[PDB]
Amino acid sequence: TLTENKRKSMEKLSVDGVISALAFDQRGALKRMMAQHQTKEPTVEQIEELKSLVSEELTPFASSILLDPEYGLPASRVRSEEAGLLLAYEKTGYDATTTSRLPDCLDVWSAKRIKEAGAEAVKFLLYYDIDGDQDVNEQKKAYIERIGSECRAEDIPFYLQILTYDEKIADNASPEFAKVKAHKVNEAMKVFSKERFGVDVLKVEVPVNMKFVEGFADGEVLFTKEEAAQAFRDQEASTDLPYIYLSAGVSAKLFQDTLVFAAESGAKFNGVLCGRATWAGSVKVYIEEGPQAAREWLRTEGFKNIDELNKVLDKTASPWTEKM
Amino acid sequence: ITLTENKRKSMEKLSVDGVISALAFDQRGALKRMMAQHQTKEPTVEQIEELKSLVSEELTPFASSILLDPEYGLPASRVRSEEAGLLLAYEKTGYDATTTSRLPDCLDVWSAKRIKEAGAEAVKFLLYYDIDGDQDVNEQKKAYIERIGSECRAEDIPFYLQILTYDEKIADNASPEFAKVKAHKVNEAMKVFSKERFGVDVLKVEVPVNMKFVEGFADGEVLFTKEEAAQAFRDQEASTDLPYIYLSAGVSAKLFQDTLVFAAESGAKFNGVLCGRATWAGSVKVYIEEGPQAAREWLRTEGFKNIDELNKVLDKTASPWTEK
Ligand SMILES: [Ca+2]
Ligand SMILES: [Ca+2]
Ligand SMILES: [Ca+2]
Ligand SMILES: [Ca+2]
Ligand SMILES: [Ca+2]
């Protein structure tokens, strides 16, 4: 199930078997945010500095941090010594002119190099449509096998992130996609839980768009609480691997309500990958007010944000040590 | 070296008394172009698959193993002599002639795990490498080979790395201009890819000299004395402690055989060969023009004569990899 070194790495990424990972491997996305508050093009120096500030100030309150090798290596070196490190292995984005969204590793990186850079885990993002072109998915499955094999050889945990989509639906925030999301998410988890892919932890979406669930919905309601709850139980039944939720797309408050709903429904999720919901406010402050201002924001609102999340995690998350 | 139990067993299957006498037939596009010279119609998948099966069935009784391609070669792999091991090619063929980078790329729906599952005892990968070339291109190449070596470590299957050298600024590798730098290209690349981080088990390489320019073998211009050519072989032997075998490329069976004798007398302790075209080339024309049974007869006579002479020469020239 786990080797000695994989186990020690998992322990370093976790606290009492729960993963509270701070996500900051954003690259193009972060540049765009920064680009909001200044005229000049955001610089390499600024991106590297902001990542270092967030890492330095908030990793004492996180079990681990996810960074990118492109801008995040300086930040990784100033993380809390008690915090583990995950490094992203994939190139960002996808070709919007096609529907295949094929995976591609960073050109001058390898699992070995990620380990050599001091990571306790390899993170890789895969876009997957279970109902998509079968040859496309065969290529995707082959690619993940390679990465899973690399990680076994280098004896470093493999964190596979799955973002689902539909080749025929442009907007994943649409009601049309919400109706099939549980299917997309849970069936993908079933595929990638197979031993052949070498995954140690799955980083996945919640199997429902909570914005369409009764009580959580501001607008149209597509699902009852009981229907949403069943999707979470179906997800829990879709894998025996540790899995953690990504907070991408929703507010901090909604994500936290979702963790509660997940736990109450019977999901035994083992933590979260949360980023933007925690450090977003530091970006404008850093750009408009500079480095020191960001530190004080991070020591105050930043701590409050991640502290609130941790308190929610305490009463909702299950330790991965109960899956081993 | 060090080997795991399975890697050793696989190596044993590919070898006889520590010597690799491998038949190479992973040609794809190259083989198609050969066939097209003898008929009007485009060569069919059926034809390519059939000729590979004929060569495998008829000649693998006289080889320690056979190298085949996944694309057309799987049926052929299943009719090889039970005493012969199997290598499968992992790389896409060819390179972009409009650029000088010649970047490597694995077959889209394959992985080291899938190659193993297809019954192979080795993963073979061809890398084009110019040691003096663009440093960033070579960084990308080194990262890529690290990934493959790691795969093979995890799947516990020997990694056979084929290196073909070139120069970004020299169009023809058969030129006297390239002959003057070949030893450098070949021997320095071997030093690089003998590093532990690349996970190579056997290197498949060019002889470090173009013998057609060596005194006594040369019809035209003479660039090297025999002592100079001999020194290039000693320099090559001094470039690696890994098992390595010579590819014939590039040359006639007789010249190749004379080259093996010269290599051994010079002090090269090479551990076998990967020989293909020099052995089975004549069967292509026969197969297309006269059909399968005629090709079998060609293979049983001239084909056998080619590989039999080679085997006798190997027997007195090659050194066992088991002394490493
Ligand atoms: Ca721990
Ligand atoms: Ca709430
Ligand atoms: Ca023709
Ligand atoms: Ca040596
Ligand atoms: Ca001998």
Burial (CB < 10 A; 0-12, 13-18, 19+), residue B24, is: buried
The three-class DSSP label of residue A290 is: coil
CA A32/CA A51 separation, integer angstroms: 15
The three-class DSSP label of residue B288 is: helix
**C-beta atoms of B113 and A154 within 8 A:** no
Q: CA of B148: how far to CAs of A88, A125, A199, B274, in Å?
A: 19, 20, 18, 20
Say how many Å lie between the first and final Cα of chain A, rounded. Answer: 7
CA B245/CA B196 separation, integer angstroms: 18
CATH code: domain of residue A144: 3.20.20.70
Domain housing B146: 1-324
Half-sphere exposure of B257 (CA within 13 A, CB side): 16
Burial (CB < 10 A; 0-12, 13-18, 19+), residue B172, is: exposed
Stated in angstroms to one decimal place, the resolution of this structure is 2.0
The stretches of A70-213 forming alpha helices (DSSP H) are 73-77, 111-116, 134-154, 175-192
Q: Gaps in chain A (C–N > 2.5 Å) come after which residues?
A: none
Which of A107, A135, A150 lies closest to B154 in CB terms? A150
CA A28/CA A120 separation, integer angstroms: 24
Residues 254-293 of A with CB under 8 A from B: none
The answer to whether the Cα torsion of A322, A230, A180, A214 is positive or negative is negative
A135 at the B interface (CB within 8 A)? yes
**C-beta atoms of B112 and A198 within 8 A:** no
Interface contacts A/B by beta carbons within 8 Å: 60
**C-beta atoms of B147 and A196 within 8 A:** no
B140 at the A interface (CB within 8 A)? yes
CA A251/CA A14 separation, integer angstroms: 24
What's the total number of domains in chain B?
1
Amino acid at A237: A
With contact defined as beta carbons under 8 Å apart, do B279 and B60 qualify?
Answer: no
**Determination technique for this entry:** X-ray
